[PDB]
C-alpha cells in the first residue's frame, strides 16, 4: 500500500506541481548541476561557473 502516495505524488507534481524559479530550490547545492537551470537546456549549460573546488 505504501507506493500509492508515491505514484500519486509523482503524477500530480509532474503535471501541476509547484514551479521552480531559482537554480537550486534546496538552497545549498554543492555539485555543479545546481548552478544551471531547472530544467537544464538541451545542452545543459547556458554558462559554466568558475570551477575551483568540490
Partner 1 sequence: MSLATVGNNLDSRYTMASGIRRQINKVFPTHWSFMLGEIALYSFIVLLLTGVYLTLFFDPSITKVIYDGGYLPLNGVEMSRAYATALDISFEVRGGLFIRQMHHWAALLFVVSMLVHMLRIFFTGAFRRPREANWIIGVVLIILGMAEGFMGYSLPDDLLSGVGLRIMSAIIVGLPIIGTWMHWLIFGGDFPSDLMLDRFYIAHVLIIPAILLGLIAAHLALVWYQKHTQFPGAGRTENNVIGIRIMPLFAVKAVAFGLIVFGFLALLAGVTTINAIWNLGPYNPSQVSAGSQPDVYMLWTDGAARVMPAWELYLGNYTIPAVFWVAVMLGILVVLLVTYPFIERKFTGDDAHHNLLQRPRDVPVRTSLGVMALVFYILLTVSGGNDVYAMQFHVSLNAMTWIGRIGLIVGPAIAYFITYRLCIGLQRSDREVLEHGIETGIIKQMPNGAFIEVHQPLGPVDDHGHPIPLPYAGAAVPKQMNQLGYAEVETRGGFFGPDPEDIRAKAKEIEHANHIEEANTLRALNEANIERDK
Catalog residues that contact partner 1 under the rule CB under 8 A.
Answer: 42-48
Nearest to 17 by CA among 25, 34, 37: 25
33 half-sphere exposure, CB direction, 13 A CA radius = 4
Which residue, 24 or 36, has its beta carbon nearer to partner 1? 36
Q: Looking up cell 514551479, which residue turns up?
A: 19
Q: How far is the CB of 44 from partner 1 (least distance, A)?
A: 7
Which residue, 1 or 42, has its beta carbon nearer to partner 1? 42
Q: How far is the CB of 42 from partner 1 (least distance, A)?
A: 8
Amino acid at each position: 500500500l505504501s507506493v500509492i502516495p508515491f505514484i500519486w505524488n509523482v503524477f500530480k507534481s509532474w503535471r501541476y506541481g509547484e514551479l521552480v524559479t531559482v537554480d537550486d530550490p534546496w538552497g545549498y547545492g554543492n555539485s555543479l548541476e545546481w548552478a544551471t537551470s531547472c530544467p537544464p537546456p538541451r545542452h545543459n549549460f547556458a554558462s559554466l561557473p568558475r570551477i575551483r573546488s568540490e
